[PDB]
């Protein structure tokens, strides 16, 4: 439950399973900037430039995507996964990340990317801190 120091997240990825027309590029860039600042201020800095940011659709897209990521980006520390409401994509991200490829993933809801609040960003930093701590 305690906050872990020493975490720096330099290589990370975004997979957006929410529809681009709903969660546009500027939503992603804005969400990301807000996340960079609060994680910085908290002392678990996530660098502002993700190594990869793409839209995907459907649970079947998850495993080919993570394979690509794992095959392409050495030192990949985290995949942030944006979800549009209740979706089987969540189950699949966890199956593949935790069980198949050993890749750390953190899911977040589309609504919290379209409009951030300090508290929802805080919730996310803590979930991330526990994971990589």
Binding-site ranges for ligand AMP (CB under 6 A): 83, 86-87, 90, 105-109, 127
CB of 128 to ligand AMP, least distance (A): 8
Nearer to ligand AMP, 71 or 120 (CB): 120
CB of 105 to ligand AMP, least distance (A): 6
CB of 107 to ligand AMP, least distance (A): 3
Nearer to ligand AMP, 47 or 120 (CB): 120
Cβ contact 44:10 at 8 Å:
no
Nearest to 108 by CA among 99, 95, 48, 122: 122
3-state SS of the chain: helix, strand, coil percent to 5?
50, 15, 35
- 13 DSSP β-pair partners: 52, 79
Nearer to ligand AMP, 32 or 105 (CB): 105
């Amino acid at each position: 439950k305690q906050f872990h120091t020493g975490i720096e997240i330099k290589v990370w990825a975004i997979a957006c399973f929410a529809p681009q027309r709903q969660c546009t590029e500027v939503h992603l860039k804005s969400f990301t900037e807000q996340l960079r600042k609060i994680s910085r201020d908290a002392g678990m800095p996530i660098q502002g430039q993700p190594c990869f940011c793409k839209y995907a659709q459907g649970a079947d897209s998850v495993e080919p995507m993570f394979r690509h990521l794992k095959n392409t980006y050495a030192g990949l520390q985290l995949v942030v996964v944006i979800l549009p409401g209740k979706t089987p994509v969540y189950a699949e991200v966890k199956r593949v990340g935790d069980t198949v490829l050993g890749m750390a993933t953190q899911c977040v809801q589309m609504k919290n990317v379209q409009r951030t609040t300090p508290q929802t960003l805080s919730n996310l930093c803590l979930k991330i801190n526990v994971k990589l701590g």
